[PDB]
Amino acid sequence: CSPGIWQLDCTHLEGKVILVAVHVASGYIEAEVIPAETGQETAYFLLKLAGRWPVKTVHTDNGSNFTSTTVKAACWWAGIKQEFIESMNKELKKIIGQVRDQAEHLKTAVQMAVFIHNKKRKGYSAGERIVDIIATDIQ
Amino acid sequence: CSPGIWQLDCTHLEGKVILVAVHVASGYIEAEVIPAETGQETAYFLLKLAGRWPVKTVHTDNGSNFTSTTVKAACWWAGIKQEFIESMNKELKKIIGQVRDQAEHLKTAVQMAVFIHNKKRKGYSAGERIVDIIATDIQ
Numbered sequence: 001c002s003p004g005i006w007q008l009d010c011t012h013l014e015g016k017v018i019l020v021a022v023h024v025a026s027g028y029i030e031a032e033v034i035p036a037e038t039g040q041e042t043a044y045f046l047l048k049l050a051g052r053w054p055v056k057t058v059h060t061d062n063g064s065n066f067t068s069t070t071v072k073a074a075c076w077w078a079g080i081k082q083e084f085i086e087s088m089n090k091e092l093k094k095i096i097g098q099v100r101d102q103a104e105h106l107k108t109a110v111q112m113a114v115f116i117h118n119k120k121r122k123g124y125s126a127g128e129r130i131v132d133i134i135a136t137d138i139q
Numbered sequence: 140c141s142p143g144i145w146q147l148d149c150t151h152l153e154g155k156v157i158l159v160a161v162h163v164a165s166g167y168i169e170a171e172v173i174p175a176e177t178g179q180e181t182a183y184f185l186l187k188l189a190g191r192w193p194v195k196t197v198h199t200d201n202g203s204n205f206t207s208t209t210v211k212a213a214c215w216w217a218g219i220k221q222e223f224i225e226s227m228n229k230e231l232k233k234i235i236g237q238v239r240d241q242a243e244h245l246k247t248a249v250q251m252a253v254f255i256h257n258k259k260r261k262g263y264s265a266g267e268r269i270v271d272i273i274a275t276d277i278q
């Protein structure tokens with residue numbers, strides 16, 4: 001429940017890679033579809049995320065993801081430390097499946113799924129919860 | 140100062156296109172580097188943004204950006220309406236210039252610049268302000 005904790009993983013769909021970030025306290029996510037499951041992709045993603053949110057620690061279900069020099073450079077620069085129960089990859093995958101017919105590209109469907117999950121209330125939505133948590137923590 | 144208002148534009152650097160989003164009330168931004176300045180890129184960006192934040196209206200300095208069918212589809216689905224003094228593209232560009240030497244790719248420098256701007260206090264930072272504004276508006 002610490003507010004600066006995020007979880008990062010890659011799932012595979014349609015021979016494509018989806019990078020999924022979860023803010024643990026709230027259940028909010030960001031995701032992107034990447035061409036390849038490399039360290040460079042992760043590092044860049046981390047950079048984007050850190051600029052957006054106050055990211056203090058990151059946990060992953062695959063430790064080897066975080067061994068690249070590039071990833072380390074990103075965590076060093078942005079001041080992120082590594083951390084050593086979702087499972088929203090299933091839920092996200094579920095939502096992607098429902099809307100997949102709607103879009104040509106997998107990435108579009110993924111973004112649609114992110115939108116639905118973050119928005120849905122079950123009574124704040126995750127999108128509401130993350131702002132509430134972060135703002136409160138600020139003062 | 141309405142909390143759901145965002146501003147979207149493209150600047151050019153190094154023969155590359157940067158899409159920049161500003162949350163007007165706070166000065167917070169998100170940016171991406173895109174290959175080409177197309178409607179499809181914008182639509183996809185909008186989707187990502189809308190999932191992340193509560194986006195009610197979007198203004199741009201180039202109205203023709205928003206004429207593509209693809210963009211319209213994105214605004215329709217996410218419930219965004221069009222809206223008809225930054226100028227942070229200069230400031231962002233300024234920051235990109237300072238750090239450009241640090242990275243090989245322009246995109247990395249851009250993300251670095253986003254991070255610096257959102258973080259900097261001058262006394263909340265923009266990153267703080269956007270959460271404060273959105274959370275407050277929620278209750």
Ligand SMILES: Cc1nc(NC(=O)NC2CCCCC2)c(C)c([C@H](OC(C)(C)C)C(=O)O)c1-c1ccc2c(c1C)CCCO2
Binds near residue numbers: 209216
């Ligand atoms: C509306 C839309 N179109 C395309 N591609 C097209 O060829 N569209 C032409 C537009 C002129 C008239 C004939 C059809 C695509 C590719 C998309 C989506 O792709 C992007 C990258 C643009 C998001 C897609 O993957 O389906 C869309 C589109 C755009 C936004 C959007 C949705 C779609 C289908 C679905 C709902 C969420 O918002």
Ligand SMILES: Cc1nc(NC(=O)NC2CCCCC2)c(C)c([C@H](OC(C)(C)C)C(=O)O)c1-c1ccc2c(c1C)CCCO2
Binds near residue numbers: 073
């Ligand atoms: C550290 C880093 N490296 C590369 N590329 C490499 O070839 N790195 C190898 C790593 C093994 C030992 C020799 C050097 C790149 C391209 C980057 C940046 O690119 C990505 C896409 C990975 C972000 C870059 O554009 O410079 C970096 C890198 C990664 C993170 C990072 C920074 C850099 C330079 C700069 C500070 C912010 O965080």
